[model samples]
Target chain A: MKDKIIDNAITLFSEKGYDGTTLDDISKSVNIKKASLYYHYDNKEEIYRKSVENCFNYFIDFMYSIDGLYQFLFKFIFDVDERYIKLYVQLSSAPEALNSEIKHHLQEINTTLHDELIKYYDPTHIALDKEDFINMILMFLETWYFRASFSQKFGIIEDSKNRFKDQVYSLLNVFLK
Target chain B: MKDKIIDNAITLFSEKGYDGTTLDDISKSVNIKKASLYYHYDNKEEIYRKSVENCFNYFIDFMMRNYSIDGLYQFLFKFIFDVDERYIKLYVQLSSAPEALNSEIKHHLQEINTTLHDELIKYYDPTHIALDKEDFINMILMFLETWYFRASFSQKFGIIEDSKNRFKDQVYSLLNVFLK
Candidate 1:
């Protein structure tokens, strides 16, 4: 029942926008009484957070729950190995839509990654705008994840893990000498 | 008058699907009645086909006209900057090939999607360093889509000029990181 509510919340938050969606809206979509939603989620923020953590189930156990996003991604990109992120969930839709509160999470994660990113490599001469640089990287990650999800759906197979690793390192190499 | 009808047609068809939009609405949009439209177009189908083709050509030709990736980005950025609410409504509301009235529209419409995708990869005569060309192109296409959402979001909230500059800087920043 909790998982089902997240499903409809994802759809409503997307179609109606974050602020546009309400507890009642989510409850109505779930075909449950309004107060009944309290048993699952305390508030909209909790449900939204679950959606982010789940990330269409791409990151639930691996990235968000176990290692955390920034730490997992730092190694995922910089490490010299194939990290085959399991796409167990169906790719039924586009990437998760983000709202303002989610923006706070994204910005903090960006800061964490940006600070840690410069350790092994130098962006001293790269003319990097810290925000845009991070934004582009996240976009790349989301894009790769979406592509992998689609390929999996179509039964297309071709070293998906290695291809993802190479792409991330390529972006990093843009600044390397 | 023909152009005006197409202009209004674009808006209506975008707001209403092809099946939903009627000759009466298109005619009323241009301050003319249904019979008056006969001078410019033989029928509603003619008008619908022409308007759809016009939009496809407008967007597709710019990207394909020059084989430069930078030029491609520039055209897309400008489209974002100048795109009408109606244009966005049209774009957001558009259906793919299957839902169209005929396959004639379907073939070119399908090509319109592939042309830009194919063109982006074509222009990228990459001095390949690490990843394959398709991977790099996928990064770029993804970048475009991401920022387009950002642009739309900002515009939806009334952040215009700053959004434009931010978008341009982000594009250049992205290009510099990868292209430069």
Candidate 2:
């Protein structure tokens, strides 16, 4: 039943967009009463948050299992567009309007992924100071998030990923020196 | 009066996203009767399209005058994000909508710019096959477009530009075989 709700929500959310969708929309699509939806989840926001959370877990586990985090990062950078299309749909809209608890949960997920990625670098990965490394890491992560959205808009997902991979490899080479 | 309307519309559109704004909202903002707006534009969509077209002209002209067309193409690999925040806000929002006209206009703008850039490349010394060159050109342009929106979201215009420049210099070196 949980899988049924999530699967239906993903399809509807991807179609209607986050702000355009409502709990009633999900309930109606699932053929369940609005009150019944509360049995599985507290609200629509909870459903959305849980769906994203499930994907993030899969993503993190994928990251953790890789031989090198950089390889995983490369794949994540490439695969994330398709893998998190629904989340991208939601985040691209007004994510702040999402419930505060869900917002906090997203932050926690983001921070965990970030810290794990940061582990690959040494204390002195570049000539830049430690503080600069932190800032650069933040900037680079921001670039990926935006790139994921554009991958959808431009409809050249495969080509975009290949280009980004080459560019990232080149940047990594430069940064390591 | 037209200038006032465009400016007001740009502000509201940027704040509210595209669907959230309407002809009545724009009319109210400009203190013009809804019917008065029809005199300037057949519809709200027309007004929005014109605004984007106007911005694209400014954008393309700025690139051409400041940096020659080739230079614009090259610099655009980095500077485009900082160059058009206002247009990016509206364009990104509208690109997802069901409006065929708006999507076609957007495609036209992209194709024109790509054609201009492609034409300017003939002056540079050649290295890669025509196909490879085209691929490289598209790659850089896609990267810039993607980077620009993300940069706008973070309010990190300066950093985005700097990264774009970093990437541009990287691209310039790769295409060094083409430089005289």
Candidate 3:
């Protein structure tokens, strides 16, 4: 029941944003009474925090299990849940609107990904500066995810993942050479 | 008067989106009666279409004036870095709702994309890089759109000037790898 609340909350929050959604709306979506919702969460803010944490937990676990930066990028593009992607993008839309806990989670996710990429790349051999390489990878991932989540016209393309993989490989070849 | 309506309509549409903003809201923004607005535009859709075309027309004209790939990238980064918030918001909203946009607007966007890809290929080729030219163009497009979207929605990223310089340098370094 708690997981279901979080799941539905993620969708609601993603679609309507933080201020736009109410506790009553979440409870109604999950078919629980508002009183029952209070039993689980103290308020809408609590629910929003939990939803974001839940997503990052899943994201971190999957991302850590990946073997390399290339594989991580591929899985990030092709394998992650669309709801989580939407939630991530939606939350990122307004950083000032996010609570400290949510902000911490975002930073942790970024730091973890950055550390993993550093470990994956040969520090001495790369052409671009470490920060620049990392930023470029992040920029590509964000762009791909944005298109996949928000742009139906771009999302409809069947071979986007393959194209993305090719692009990444091309960059890696040049930088790692 | 029609241009005034288009200017105000862009701001309103940027804030409220298509369904959220009405003819009355646009007229109020422009300091005119709703009936007066109707005299210039048939309805909200007409105003919305015109506003979008106005933005794209400006973009197309500026983009066409650049000659080299490097020049294009610099111009694009600088333009987006300094673009008005309302125009950025309007562009993002339409991008998010391409289905609701008119066919002409859609075709214009497609034309812009195609032209950009052609220009990019004409400047760089397979000898310059191992990746397909089209793929490189798509990556650049994606980067440009993401930069605009992020800048519009999140000010926490810090000054646009710093981010713009860093992004431009990063892209140039990557391109220089292939160029060499």
Candidate 4:
């Protein structure tokens, strides 16, 4: 019943602002009594937070559903949260890992990246191509991340922060040349 | 039951080589009857391989269980196989991932590598330990490993075998120059 209320509340909340929607309206949409709806949710804010959480988890889920390597690794290396770096490892590692909802959506971003990289580089020399750079960057992320990640484990704490800039310069040196 | 047999077989095989160990001996060691031991395995050879696999896996496990990186990365870069790179990513990736066997063993290698790298990197500053040296080696190793490993996957696309071979030699030659 609470779950049903959340569903209806999400739809209505989007259409009408929070102040515009009330418990009575949500109860009516989910086909429940106002008293029962209020029992689960103290107020509209609780439902709103839950809905947002659901949507955000899905947003992250969609991100994890695609590419699985290069995209996330790039983010993982450059600027991101540890929870995310700790993703995919846990994802493909097994169990709850592995998702599949957006197909066209997945390839859409991948192709977009390919076109973007091709245009940006414009290279026919030196076996350069789309998948080539992506894989190159993929390996780059692996070394940078694991080296950085394990540096902390091995107790080389201070310079780990410095290592990020070191890597970027190293990367640019390749493109710089 | 079969697990118990493997455990005992590993013990006997190590102490008494394959020829020295027999089914009856294995069953006695495992507290199982001869037929029971034979049920799961074909003969001494199967048991031998199983024992080796167990020992080999533990060897890998001990490595993975410790440090979990750096050590493995260096080995991964030098001249290893894909099944290994597919390791830790798969190991720490989840299920089979984690281990906690050897505390002393793990740190020993970590410290040894640290000392060795320190000894090797004792330059660039000319006085005191030069962090610059350490960082360069770290950077080179990262680049080298990534290059060699990926070369195997998308062979001719980015860098091919010949390129990797030459690059490896080039890196080694540079190191040889450094050795002086």
Candidate 5:
């Protein structure tokens, strides 16, 4: 029941914002009464923190387990489940007014991911400064993520995902060289 | 009075999305009565359309006046970096819900995009670059727009703040990679 509540919270939070969604909305979506929701979680912030942590935990685990940088990035952009993608867009694009705990958790995950990338890419191999290289990759990933989320609405890049991946790979090839 | 309403609408729409923001929100923001708002614009949609058009028209005029590729690039880099957070949010949110917007507003956005693309192509002189000109322009625009989005939202992610000049220099160096 608790897991079910978290799952629905993720979807609601993604569609509406942290403040936009109410506990009543979340409970109704899960087919539970508001009182029952309070039984599982004390408040909306608790539910929000749990939902965010659940989503990032999956990403962190994937990062630690993936063998190659290229493969990890390819999957990160192309192969992750839609739910995680929605969670990512919701959390990343969230207003700065969000709870401090939410922000801290996101920062910790970013640092972990950056450290892993440094280890995987090995700074000496790339000509660009470490900060610049990381920023470039971060920008690329963020754009791709945003594009994927709104591809149907914007119709900016109507090509197949594989073709998009190829374009990014080509760009990375130049940057890495 | 209408301009004041539009300006306040921009700020409210940036903070609260179209549906989230009420007509009362705009009127209050501008220190006017709600009845005064209805006098200027028929509905919330009208206010949104006008505010967006106002912002994009300014962008289009700036693009039309800037000719050289270097000048355009420099201007774009600085303009995007310096834009207000409210404008960025409003633009991005509207983009995410293009289907909900009126066709005329969508047309305006498309026109702005095409104009920017044409200006970029003229500056790059597509024939000089090895990469496809269209592809190059698309990537550059994507990168710039994403930078604006991240700049507004990613501070909480705790990335270090370097000198803006250094950041601009890095972007130019990367662009030179494709140009060369």
Candidate 6:
């Protein structure tokens, strides 16, 4: 029941601005009484925070959970890699539709991911630091879909996932340098 | 008449997302009758396009008109060097409120800007290109303002324009190796 509320909250907050939404909005959206929602969370902001936190946590775990030498490559390929493109496109195209809390969480997530990438990779080169990693990840995300589209248009590959993995592997090696 | 309609369209579109707004909304906001709006524009989409075009034109003119010895540096400083940071702050904060069409235009603008930057500079030398005198102007606009709080935290610099020139000059020489 609690998880259901959070799911509803995430979807609502994503669709409506945080301020634009109300506790009643979530309660009604989930087809639950307003009192039932309060049983799960304190207030709208708290619900908003939790939803944002949940998204970030998913990302952190996704990146950190992978194993083997190709873990970083896989993490980039499957998780942080795909959204890097989608999120930037969404942010660029539909920023006004995002909630304030979601936007704040995004910046926080980016910084956290950057720092984690530095620590996980353990690069000898100082240039491959947290901030730069974050920037590169973001830049890659912004252009990924477009690149994927072109790749498809030109018959570059039959499978986008493989192509994406290959590209990310090359990028990961450069950072490992 | 077209100019007036475009000006009104920008204000409405920027403030209200596309679906939230109607043709009547534009007509009412501009203080003209709905029928009068048709004289210049064929539809809401046409009005939006003109408004977006206006924004791009204004931005491009701002870049082209700011003639200095170093066009890139001047552009960098000028880009961050705003008359008012309020627009940037509001612009950032308002992302959550965008509708589909508003979002579309915003993405179009980003693509156009990115393309322009790539056309003007090379990506092979990312760091060098980022630090180039001309690129600084463009970079500051594209990059720094994304992270830094330029609008609400105005104690150090009351407005962007007032401190832009001095700030650019201070960062100009040091920015070279800071790239790679």
Stretches of model 3 off by over 4 angstroms after superposition: A1-6, A12-58, A64-67, A92-106, A123-129, A151-159, B16-25, B42-46, B69-73, B95-109, B125-139, B153-162
Off by over 4 Å in 1: A1-129, A137-177, B15-23, B35-50, B66-79, B82-85, B95-109, B125-132, B160-162
Best by DockQ: 5
Clashes of each: 0, 0, 0, 1, 0, 17
| Per-prediction CA RMSD (Å) | 9.1, 6.9, 4.6, 15.6, 3.9, 8.5
Supply the TM-score of chain A against the true chain A for every candidate structure.
0.40, 0.67, 0.75, 0.40, 0.75, 0.48
Output the better candidate (3/5) by DockQ: 5
What are the per-residue Cα lDDT tens digits for candidate 4 across B78-153? 4333333332222221111113323332353355345434433432342332224545456445554444233322
What is candidate 1's TM-score against the reference?
Answer: 0.51
**Model 6 lDDT per residue over A1-177, tens place:** 667777777666544445445788899977877887777656765776666566667666665322343565554545553323322222322333345545565566556756665555444543355545544444344334433322322333422567556655554444444
lDDT of 3 by residue, A23-96 (tens): 88899988888987987666777788788888888888887222356677777877887667767765534434
Off by over 4 Å in 5: A34-45, A64-67, A92-99, A122-132, A152-160, A173-177, B55-69, B95-99, B102-112, B125-135, B154-166, B176-180
- The list of candidate 2 runs beyond 4 A from truth reads A1-16, A19-69, A81-86, A89-110, A123-141, A156-159, A170-177, B61-85, B99-151, B155-180
Mind giving the per-residue lDDT tens digits that candidate 4 earns over A1-177? 667776676665443334346789998897777787888665666776565444445434544222333345445555543333332122221111112322222234445544545544434332234445544444455455344433433344322545654554554343323
Evaluate residue B42 in candidate 1 and report its C-alpha lDDT on the 0 to 100 scale: 88
Shift in Å, residue B132, candidate 6: 12
Tens digit of per-residue lDDT, candidate 1, span B1-180: 988999999977755545457999999998997999998788877787787777767667555554576665676576556655554444432322123344554455457547757767765756622435765676666755445344444543333421666767666666655553
Q: List the residue pairs that clash in candidate 1.
A: none
Measured by TM-score, the strongest candidate is 5
Docking level of model 1: incorrect
Docking class of 5: acceptable
Q: What's the TM-score of each model vs. the native?
A: 0.51, 0.62, 0.74, 0.38, 0.80, 0.50
C-alpha lDDT (0 to 100) for residue B91 of candidate 5:
63
> Candidate 4: interface RMSD in Å?
17.2
DockQ of each: 0.13, 0.16, 0.27, 0.08, 0.32, 0.09
Residue B155's lDDT in candidate 1: 41
TM-score of 2: 0.62
Candidates, ranked, DockQ? 5, 3, 2, 1, 6, 4
Error of 5 at B111 (Å): 4.4
Residue-level lDDT of model 3, residues B6-118, one tens digit each, is 88888777666565578888888778888988677787777878889998876676556654656646755666566666776666555434245646655776676677666
